[PDB]
């Protein structure tokens with residue numbers, strides 16, 4: 128079998144180190160289609176199957192129509208083939224890193240969260256309840272130190288097994304309030320029959336994600352910008368408050384000193 132993998136995370140998560148650990152010398156650098164941003168790909172073989180990896184440039188959030196990397200990441204997460212998205216997270220910086228994790232989880236594409244730098248976490252005497260973390264995120268969570276070649280080889284076994292099983296998702300109970308949820312419900316029908324959850328596309332449209340908006344006909348686009356004006360409060364602040372509230376609750380149940 129040939130499996131397609133996308134790797135994504137904040138800058139300084141250890142993504143390059145993990146990528147190198149997985150692929151070694153079998154890496155290439157080219158360009159993302161349409162632009163001049165470098166595109167890194169790699170591969171490895173494990174137990175007879177091929178794993179084709181595409182790295183995404185490090186970003187802290189998906190595109191929200193503000194102000195190139197965020198646009199490339201949004202494009203790939205919405206439209207690039209992948210049997211699984213690997214979200215690399217710095218375990219010592221959970222509240223900030225898991226912001227993009229929640230945006231990725233809303234898409235409902237198969238994904239796993241890799242908590243990196245568990246060795247750095249141990250030095251701080253912090254313990255993470257990984258079963259609780261899996262419960263809050265609704266996707267598999269694997270923990271490691273990507274600077275450890277043995278843990279990366281074990282990760283390959285676990286990743287291969289998950290890909291063969293198929294990844295079981297429980298979608299996140301993120302509720303944005305009666306008002307915003309009514310706007311989501313209003314837009315969802317125009318985003319049906321797409322490769323990604325219609326709910327997630329409606330939220331991204333309201334967040335003004337350029338990859339979503341750019342594909343809309345003028346009348347669709349007008350309907351989106353109308354529902355944006357219907358929101359009594361600032362959408363970017365609204366969705367951040369909802370996401371960071373959830374993450375505060377997550378960290379209270381997962382993180383112990």
Ligand SMILES: Nc1nc2c(ncn2[C@@H]2O[C@H](COP(=O)(O)OP(=O)(O)O)[C@@H](O)[C@H]2O)c(=O)[nH]1
Pocket residue numbers: 136137138139140141142143144145185243244245246247271272273274275
């Ligand atoms: N303590 C620790 N540091 C790590 C680990 N993986 C990466 N790092 C360090 O994190 C920093 C950034 O790693 P890098 O792979 O370049 O991050 P990237 O920007 O996400 O690609 C580097 O100093 C790495 O050596 C790990 O498992 N444990």
